[PDB]
């Protein structure tokens, strides 16, 4: 299955964090990286008292079940010093969000796929479009068309 994973970081040297995350993602069992996006510098969504983010996206081929993939992405966040604050949308060393897990629709307590807010976020859609321009969502929408409709600002390279 092709999983598309969003990467974000705005603490503790985001470029190093993203590079470390990519290495670690490739080391996940029964999985391998297919494609990686460019790195983008994006202003924070949410509270404005935090640094700009490095955002990227990666396509990962995996034979893991989705929740087992989640266990592994969460482990990588923790290995990279992720600390979860009280405030929503606050800063973090590393954030790995499963945007899509093949064409699956998943609704559980731990996991919602497609990622619940991705269609509203240029910092998720643009890096995804760079690596999967032909992508169609489980609901039948084309990524290319969602981008056309929303006309989100284009991103700047990190
Ligand atoms: N598709 C998905 N990818 C990753 N985590 C997901 C997820 N769907 C649900 N979750 C859940 O989201 C919980 C909180 O994850 P956090 O990383 O702290 C939220 P965040 O990514 O900072 O904000 P955001 O979801 O608004 O982007 C996790 O413990 C996980 O169970
Ligand atoms: N620019 C940007 N802003 C955010 C991001 C993110 O990845 N990029 N993620 C958030 C919660 O996960 C908080 N707001
Ligand atoms: Cl969808
Ligand atoms: Mg997250
Ligand atoms: Mg997130």
Secondary structure of the chain in HEC code, one letter for each residue = CEEEEEEEECCCCHHHHHHHHHHHHHCCCCEEEEEECCCEEECCCCCCCCCCEEEEEEEEEECCCHHHHHHHHHHHHHHCCCCCCCCCCCCCCCEEEEEEECCCCEECCCCEECCCCHHHCHHHHHHHHHHCCCCECCCCCEHHHHHHHHCCCCCEEC
Q: Tokens for 155?
A: 């991103």
Task: Specify whether the CB–CB gap between 155 and 60 falls below 8 A.
Answer: no
- Closest Cα partner for 5 from 138, 96, 130, 93? 96
**Residue whose C-alpha is closest to residue 158's, from 20, 26, 18, 54:** 54
| Ligand 2 in reach of 44 Cβ (< 6 A) | yes
d(CA 80, CA 41): 20
**Burial class, 22, CB count within 10 angstroms (exposed 0-12 / middle 13-18 / buried 19+):** middle
Superfamily of domain covering 1-158: 7,8-Dihydro-6-hydroxymethylpterin-pyrophosphokinase HPPK (3.30.70.560)
Question: Which of 111, 118, 120, 125 to mutate to test ligand 1, by most ligand atoms within 8 A of the CB atom?
Answer: 111
Q: Which of 50, 97, 128, 137 to mutate to test the pocket of ligand 1 (most atoms within 8 A of CB)?
A: 97
Could you say which of 84, 97, 121, 144 is catalytic? Answer: 97
Backbone angles phi, psi at 26, to 5 degrees: -65, -25
Which class for 110: exposed (0-12), middle (13-18), buried (19 or more C-beta within 10 A)? exposed
The token pair that represents 72 in the structure block:
């592994």
Taking the alpha carbons of 105, 106, 107, 111 in that order, is the dihedral positive or negative?
Answer: negative
Q: Pick the atom of ligand 1 nearest to 109's CA.
A: 31
Assess whether 97 carries a catalytic annotation: yes
Q: Tell which residue, 88, 11, 15, 94, has the closest CA to residue 51.
A: 11
Q: Name the experimental technique.
A: X-ray
Resolution limit, Å: 1.4
Of 144, 119, 146, nearest in space to 132 by CA: 144
- Residue found under tokens 């307590």: 109
Ligand 1, closest atom to CA 6? 3
The span from the CA of 32 to the CA of 5, in Å, is 12
- Residue 62: partners with Cβ closer than 8 Å, 6 or more residues away: 1, 3, 28, 30, 31, 32, 69
């Amino acid at each position: 299955t092709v999983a598309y994973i969003a990467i974000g970081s705005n603490l503790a040297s985001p470029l190093e964090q993203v590079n470390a995350a990519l290495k670690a993602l490739g080391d996940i069992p029964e999985s391998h990286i297919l494609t990686v996006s460019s790195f983008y510098r994006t202003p924070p969504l949410g509270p404005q008292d935090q640094p700009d983010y490095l955002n990227a996206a990666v396509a990962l081929e995996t034979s893991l079940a989705p929740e087992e993939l989640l266990n592994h992405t969460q482990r990588i966040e923790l290995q990279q010093g992720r600390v979860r604050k009280a405030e929503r949308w606050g800063p973090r060393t590393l954030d790995l969000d499963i945007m899509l897990f093949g064409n699956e629709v998943i609704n559980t307590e731990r996991l919602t796929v497609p990622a619940y807010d991705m269609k509203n976020r240029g910092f998720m859609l643009w890096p995804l479009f760079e690596i999967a321009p032909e992508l169609v969502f489980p609901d039948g929408e084309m990524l290319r068309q969602i981008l056309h409709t929303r006309a989100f600002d284009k991103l700047n390279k990190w």
